[PDB]
Assembly symmetry: C8
Homo-oligomer: 178 residues x 8
């Protein structure tokens, strides 16, 4: 019929529009490269990385000795999903405390920005949703604003970090004795 | 006729939709890379790898001496099938016991997660569906949550492992004397 | 006419469907890589490879001395045919007996699996359909199940082999003195 | 209907036009490469880079010693947005003052040109919107007109710089003792 | 008209079908690689290669000394023709006799197989249709069945050859003193 | 409607024509490579390059010592604009005078040709529109006619240059003591 | 109109058919590679190559000394023309005579074959149409039949040559003292 | 309307035909490579190259010393124009005379052939249209007929040259003392 033919043409147009929209959604790239230098005078032992958003394809390096650096990366989930890569990295230190690092590379830059944070926790604490919420909402995170930021960590330690503002994020932190 | 022409147009649209759906289903990647370090003090002899889901394209290495590592990988079946790569690797140890390792990289992440497990069985036991069910449902598997996990294996052995959370899974285990 | 135009549209749709189906049938890959180690203490002289299904593009190596290995491969027939690569390799040994090796990589995995077998025949026997049927139906073949299998061959010889379960099959056999 | 078919055809034409327009808007390239030579006799420590428009994918180098150079680059935001890369780089100098550098590579060359500026601020001042507005509107910026420009900076320093006029901008500055 | 439009549509469909058929016919590959080892104790001088089907792109090597090998190849005619590569290679030997070698790689494997033959002719005889017919129909050719075959040639010589069964044919012969 | 359908077909045809025309306009290449040898006995210091048409992607080299050469290039603006690359290069000399070099590579060769000129100005004069007009209209420029041209520059200097006639222009000038 | 629309559809179909036919005609390859060894004891000086059909892209080597070889090639005319590469090569010898070599690689193998000829002419004679006709029709040319042919040339010289039968022709000739 | 729809279809067909015709016209290649060996005993200084048709992308080398060679090339104008590359190269010699070389590689081989000429002019004469007309119409040019040609130049010089007959023309000349 003429009605049926119009329906098929409309459905074909909708199919092409849907394919284009899904391809566009799936081509957004959000990834994070993390580099942390250990000058704290103690060895770091990896515990876990809690991903609020996104995932990683590699192993979190088990040991970071003093004078060495941590290399890690992650990215958003494969496919046409509108989420970024957000998470916290937790490392156990020889003193018995935990070094926690937040990163946040959002999908939607109309509402969100890049954020990062560094904090030392007393005792051995694995990264989870509660730790991420603390570091993102209550512990004064740093904006990924192409700037350098310094802050004392307590426990005779201090941090100095940098994060850019684009969706190809890179986070670089130096942990040194205060 | 006009009815016949509409039928042919609808069939053509359905053909295009089916081709796109099959291509999307067949482009999902689920693979596992396994690396196990042998520091147990004994030689491991391969028995078999039971695949609940998926397959492998390579040989399970026959021997893993003390101080050496096991390299192995697998992936989901070729084609537009909605299954992952799930299985158990069994190795015979010089003491007469079996080292069994579980991996699970599901196709559908709406309902499933990455899981892994390590266990030592008394005697020589080949990997099968029963062993997989034990390791996956009853022996407290570890989640592939980008975290490090440790557990005593018995028989004077202990394990320490890591697995990420993405569909390009990597599993790394260290078996050492306890 | 309107009837004639509908016929031409239907024939064009059928032509596209046929092209897609033939391309899909022709893209299925079934191949076998065979590696056999000779530690039997005697020299192997190639007789023939009987292909129940499929073919090979290379020469069957004429001699395999003790301490050396056989490299051979085959694959299914070119084109959109729904057959695999199935055959038996026969080598003459210095004692006057025949070493026969079965491989089977089927096209349809809904009904068939990978199979392999190793057997020593008295006298010089070339691989044919009867030998293939013996090795596949009556001599207890091993499943290509990503596992290691051992069996005494008689005549002071033993075999140990491995075959994976995918359509990119690899078969590895070690023939040693018992 | 005939009205409905016309609507679907018009919508398809509009869809093609929209795709072409978005692809054209997204193919415009605006990037800046900055190189600043330090011959001032003092060490420069990076503070931040404020981006009025655009972003960067790399780290602002933390230190620039005397006799060394600064390498930095940026570009406009990914996607079909009609903005360029505009910003200010601020470095802290050993005397306690700030070296501020402006770059401006606009999207729309019908109305804007390439601009740059160099200025020394008393005290440690991070780059922000106010600093950018000062350098761009009130401190006599130099045009990116493929010409060399020199100006005394005060504090016993002078600058000499060059910037081309295209959308693949390169800015080169030499800061020397006056 | 409506009749004329239907004719043009049918002709276009037939044109597409014809292009697909010709492309399929022209993508069939039939080639032969010949290697003959000379251990006869005499020098071979090339006479000619008669091609019943197909052709060659290279020169038939003029001399093959004792302890050396002959390299030669051929293939079916370019274009969408349904013929293979079939022919006879004739070499003159130092004793005044002719070494004749048959190869046959058919286009249609529904009806034909790979065949080869080796024979020594008294006197100097150039390869022609009669020689090909003798070798193919009356001199008991060997099947290209992935097997090794041996036969005494007379004149104190013997041959041992191998040919696979696929359209990428390879023929390997060793001519030695009997 | 039938009128509305015709309008949409006409608009689609016009869209395709516009895309082809814009692509053709944007594929015209006009670029200039400038090489000037300094044998004048004095050092050249770059002032600026005034572009009447086109732009450059590189830095104008700040110094050209005696016995060295100047490498510079430019090209027309990116996109489907119908303009070439036309400009004047000005260098300050050690004697206090200015060496000015004109190049002109037009977009439209139906009306314009390649032109170049070399002149020495008294005092330090930056290249601008007035200098370009002098060199192009009033100072007898040389045609880019694949020929060599010589002219005394005054101030004890002479020039010898060459320019080809194509849209991939190259200008080579030697400035020597007269 | 309906008549006018049918005419436009027919013209479009004819346009596609013409494009396919021209592309097919232009994809036929006919080329010749000539190699001639000079063992005549005298130096060869090139005169010319007369092309009855086709052309060459290279220089005919001016000198061929004794103990050296001639490398030359040609091919059919570019474009969809149905002609091959046919010609005669003429070289002047130190004795005052001309060495003439014919080659013929036709476009249409339904009616023509590959032919070649070698002849020595008294005096210095340049290759032309008459010489080509002599060598092709009256001087008993050799068929390019994948065979070796020998013939005395007179003047204390003899020739031995080979030519294959395909459209990628190669001609190899050895001119030696008789 | 039906008339308007037919007009739009005819215009679209004409657009496709025009695009194909322009692409075909623009794919014709006509280029010349010139190599002249200087054994005249004097230095050659480049004057210019007058292009009757076509252009060059490189510099005419300023000096050619005795015992050296001239490398030069040219080609037809970019775009779908039906012209070749035709011109004259003029070099000033140490004796005060001019060496003039003609090349002509036409676009239309239905009516024109490759031509070349070499001549020595008394005094210093730049190549122009009159010189080209002399060399092409009145000074007996040589055909680019894949042959070697020699001619005394006067002034104690002689020339020997070669030019092929295809659109990828190469001209090689040797100028030696007579
Ligand atoms: C038919 C209707 C279908 C509608 C489906 C809507 C799905 C929306 C998914 C948005 C992501 C999300 O469901 N939620 C969030 C995930 O984005 P993210 O990866 O940047 O999250 C990290 C959290 N943080 C605060 C941003 C750091 C996102 O915030 C949504 C915003 C709503 C706008
Ligand atoms: C027309 C109707 C066609 C329907 C076809 C449905 C086929 C569904 C296949 C799902 C996979 C499966 O048939 N079954 C399973 C295999 O997926 P997997 O590879 O991740 O399985 C491993 C088992 N484990 C528990 C996940 C570890 C899967 O669980 C199905 C879920 C149903 C949703
Ligand atoms: C119009 C109708 C056309 C139908 C054509 C059907 C052709 C079917 C070909 C299947 C392969 C075969 O005709 N036969 C077989 C060959 O497959 P294979 O290569 O795996 O065979 C090896 C034998 N083995 C027992 C499997 C090891 C196959 O078993 C068929 C199964 C029928 C389902
Ligand atoms: C349906 C209606 C949709 C309309 C959307 C319009 C969006 C316009 C975006 C222009 C850029 C911008 O919204 N604003 C500006 C950003 O461009 P820029 O990156 O070159 O800005 C840097 C500032 N500076 C002064 C140029 C140095 C720009 O000036 C706009 C001009 C309006 C024309
Ligand atoms: C219904 C049917 C009609 C639907 C049709 C819709 C039209 C589709 C739009 C296609 C537009 C594509 C072209 C955009 C190119 C952008 C420039 C990229 C390079 C750049 O951005 N080029 C800029 C920078 O290049 P540069 O780096 O070389 O710097 C040059 C030096 N200078 C000092 C900065 C100038 C350059 O300066 C601008 C050039 C202007 C480009 C001309 C664009 C004109 C397009 C008009 C289209 C009108 C359509 C209307 C139809 C009714
Ligand atoms: C419209 C009608 C068009 C029909 C055209 C039919 C052309 C058929 C060509 C077949 C090859 C051939 O015309 N003839 C033969 C050549 O194939 P071959 O290259 O394998 O031949 C070598 C001879 N040998 C006996 C096979 C070793 C072939 O035997 C035909 C078989 C008919 C089926
Ligand atoms: C109007 C609407 C209808 C229009 C449609 C028209 C149909 C178009 C034709 C498409 C055909 C393409 C496929 C050809 C493939 C040729 C084989 C290439 C490799 C080869 O030639 N393969 C051969 C050699 O491979 P090999 O080198 O691996 O050797 C194998 C070993 N052996 C010992 C030689 C056997 C192989 O032996 C044959 C395989 C048979 C291939 C099956 C073809 C079946 C096609 C049927 C189509 C029917 C359409 C009818 C519709 C009404
Ligand atoms: C709807 C109507 C749209 C019409 C738009 C017309 C724009 C024309 C642009 C031509 C370039 C130009 O607007 N003007 C000029 C720039 O070309 P050029 O880059 O070669 O300029 C250098 C100056 N010189 C004298 C040529 C050396 C050009 O001369 C125009 C010619 C008009 C013909
Ligand atoms: C509308 C009608 C257009 C028809 C145009 C027909 C043009 C035919 C061109 C054939 C080549 C040729 O016009 N003539 C000949 C050139 O082919 P060749 O390159 O092989 O010629 C060399 C001569 N030799 C005897 C073959 C060695 C050819 O013989 C024609 C044959 C006619 C069939
Ligand atoms: C609508 C009508 C459009 C008609 C446009 C016709 C343009 C024709 C261009 C031909 C080349 C030319 O306009 N003229 C000439 C240039 O070709 P050439 O590059 O080979 O010229 C060199 C001169 N020489 C004598 C050949 C050595 C050519 O002779 C034309 C021939 C007419 C056929
Ligand atoms: C409404 C529906 C109809 C619309 C259709 C329109 C037709 C579209 C035109 C397509 C033409 C493409 C082919 C052009 C090829 C040009 C040659 C390139 C190489 C070259 O230019 N080749 C030349 C140089 O090659 P060479 O370098 O190898 O030198 C050869 C040696 N020699 C001494 C110089 C001869 C060669 O000499 C000419 C060959 C002639 C090419 C034949 C072209 C015949 C085309 C006829 C088309 C007619 C269409 C009419 C339809 C009514």
């Amino acid at each position: 019929a003429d009605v049926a033919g119009a329906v098929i043409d409309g459905a074909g147009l909708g199919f092409d529009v849907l394919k284009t929209v899904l391809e566009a959604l799936g081509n957004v790239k959000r990834k994070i490269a993390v580099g942390i230098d250990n000058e704290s005078g103690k060895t770091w032992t990896a515990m876990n990385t809690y991903f609020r958003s996104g995932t990683s394809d590699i192993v979190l390096p088990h040991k970071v000795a003093h004078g060495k650096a941590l290399l890690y990366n992650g990215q958003k989930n494969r496919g046409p999903v509108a989420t970024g890569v957000v998470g916290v990295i937790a490392y156990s230190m020889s003193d018995g405390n935990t070094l926690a690092v937040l990163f946040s590379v959002p999908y939607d830059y109309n509402w969100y920005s890049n954020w990062w944070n560094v904090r030392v926790y007393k005792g051995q604490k694995r990264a989870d949703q509660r730790m991420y919420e603390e570091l993102y909402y209550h512990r004064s995170p740093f904006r990924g604003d192409n700037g350098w930021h310094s802050r004392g960590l307590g426990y005779g330690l201090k941090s100095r970090g940098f994060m850019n503002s684009s969706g190809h994020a890179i986070l670089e932190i130096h942990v040194t004795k205060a």
